[PDB]
Amino acid sequence: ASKEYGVTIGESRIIYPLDAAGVMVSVKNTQDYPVLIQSRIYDEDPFVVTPPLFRLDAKQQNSLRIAQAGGVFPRDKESLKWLCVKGIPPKVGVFVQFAINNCIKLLVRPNELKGTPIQFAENLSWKVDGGKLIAENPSPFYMNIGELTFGGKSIPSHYIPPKSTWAFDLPKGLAGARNVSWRIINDQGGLDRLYSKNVTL
């Protein structure tokens, strides 16, 4: 037979306005056993999660506060951190116990930035160099690509950092391919609109 595990965060990213007092995120134990919820922040401790450790009974939901106390962040660009939420269950024959560590982007956004990502999503430029599809992101936001296709073939996606680039490995068969398609993930966690463009030299 089979054991089951599951952690739910109320959102799939956290937009944190620079200098804000804090934000709240729902955490749900979707299992029929109590767990310990253990929450940590990683780089890509100015940010503090409260409570760092707490018990959550079967099928229950609680909330965490994420709060910035200090820290020094660029104001010309977004910064990226990871919020990790781990559900710790209770304690040759092979016995393994699992624990889900559910990690989401914590995006630090200066109030100094004008606009939002979906307004600049169309401005990605694309390039093949050294057998790799390279994206450039001239905007101050992380461009969180959720769908990427090149010459009709699907490429596993990754974020493009602000004012920077990212290179994607290509599967064979894309010799003279020129047409890139992409959607970003909007701030609410949804797949945004489809953009299409030819690679440049």
Binding site: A1, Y5, K28, V92, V94, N102, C103
Partner: protein, 147 residues
């Protein structure tokens, strides 16, 4: 008299991050007389679910205390510390060989987009670079780094 007014009504919809995991035990394991276990013994089957479509194989990382890149390590619960390694692997839509990260590295294949809905991984015995195996345990964290 009919009088009119208008307004553009609005709503925000939010996608939570749900990660689920099912473990199904495989057959019990047979020592072979030389103190070996057989290779490619399907130790167990993991079904990873809940994730958003577009989630990739490199956004998933199985870690254990040993931290041996690419392999998970099971240890005896006796006192004597006998060990063996496994690998975590699966198949894509072309029946090509795919693996998530295990202690931070992929064993086989390119990065792929995981299957829609859920994705199977099989834990498969490698060997035991030691030799003579005599309850074997592991405690594994599955980290999923959402897009």
């Amino acid at each position: 008299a009919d009088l009119t007014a208008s307004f553009t009504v609005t709503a925000t919809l939010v996608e939570p991050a749900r990660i689920t995991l099912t473990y199904k035990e495989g057959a019990p394991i047979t020592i072979m007389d030389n103190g070996n276990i057989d290779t490619e013994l399907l130790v167990g089957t993991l079904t990873l679910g809940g994730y958003k479509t577009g989630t990739t194989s490199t956004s998933v990382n199985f870690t254990d205390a040993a931290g041996d890149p690419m392999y998970l390590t099971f240890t005896s619960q006796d006192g004597n510390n006998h060990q063996f390694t496994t690998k975590v692997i699966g198949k894509d839509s072309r029946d090509f060989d795919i693996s998530p990260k295990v202690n931070g590295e992929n064993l086989v294949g390119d990065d792929v987009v995981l299957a829609t809905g859920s994705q199977d991984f099989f834990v498969r015995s490698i060997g035991s670079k030691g030799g003579k195996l005599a309850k074997y345990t592991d405690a594994v964290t599955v980290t999923v780094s959402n897009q």
